[PDB]
Amino acid sequence: SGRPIGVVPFQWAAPEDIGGIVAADLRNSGKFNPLDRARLPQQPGSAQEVQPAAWSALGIDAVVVGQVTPNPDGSYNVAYQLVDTGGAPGTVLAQNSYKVNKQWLRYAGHTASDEVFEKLTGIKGAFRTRIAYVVQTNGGQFPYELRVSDYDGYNQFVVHRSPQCLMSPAWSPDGSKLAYVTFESGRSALVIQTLANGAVRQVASFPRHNGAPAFSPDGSKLAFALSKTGSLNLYVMDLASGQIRQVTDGRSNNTEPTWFPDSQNLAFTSDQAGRPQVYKVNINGGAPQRITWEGSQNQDADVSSDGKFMVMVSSNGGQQHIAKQDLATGGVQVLSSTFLDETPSLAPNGTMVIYSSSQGMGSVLNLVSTDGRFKARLPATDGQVKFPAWSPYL
């Protein structure tokens, strides 16, 4: 299912298949079903060449066409037009053209997808966003790498290598920094690394565990978990002052904070009721409220950017899977069907979830659309990959 749409190979071998990136982006969203390339009624290279009737016969009311041309200096011009084949046939609904160097060709495709997506759904596109994650390689000296790639797995680069375990990266809302857990000192420490220059700020290294960071959306605070007291509890740092307040205090374990849009409330995982469940608490007036009542276990949540839902790892009768819970109804929908589903993270427009599974025996991340309609494996890495974290809008 999803809205059928025509995505035509772009007019030029071409250095990159821009039309294919657009189709893959739109499909990944769940919201679209780009027509199989072998079943296209034609391959128009321009808006004028589009025959609306041949696309409307197939249930298609919009068509993406475009052009890639070489510039004498070795750069490329990428243009797309979105042509109506429904109520205003032959009309151009959106279009753009821009000049890119060869290494920004995928990015040129993701721009087109973002604009076509927003035009047709009214939802901001997330195809130019990034993911962070940790890979344990088979290298001896620095087996752990914190890496970043495009959301779809291409254009990977290394942010930090370590001889010791890394965990749980988290993006600043401006997209310029990653917080994370490192065991490089011989025990856990929480640090924030600035991506542009690699500078590292030391945030915390209290006795026992320092973990599971999250930046508030307004950019002012970092939430995280400490076990110095005897069990894991939540704390928040005012990033300007460096000051730390305690948020949960109790004998139970409380970890994996995620922010609500207001930058004042956290959801988090607690074992207070026995098996893990998700709770909500104010970082000021402290008294946690249980919010997950389906299944027998729920954990590791990520609240959407509009505050309307969250994703999490939910267990009902033996099966642990990525699930989505409406925060104003308690209604739960199971999204993933893979094995050992863990650590979900939502795209900034709430339309896709990245998470880890048994696919590739640990070496693959997976995408699932939050409507449940589309599922895929990302390109395999050269190691075990864990703790994905989907960037803000960039």
């Binding site: 344990q136 010791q164 375990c165 965990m167 749980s168 857990v181 065991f183 856990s188 026992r208 565990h209 973990g211 599971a212 978990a225 076990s227 894991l232 374990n253 970890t255 994996e256 995982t269 074992d271 893990p276 954990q299 590791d300 863990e342 650590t343 075990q384 864990k386 703790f387």
Partner: peptide
């Protein structure tokens, strides 16, 4: 192994 001691979270012995 690096672990939060929780017995259950994502930072509980994630790397075996």
């Amino acid at each position: 192994g690096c672990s939060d001691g929780s017995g259950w979270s994502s930072e509980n012995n994630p790397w075996g």
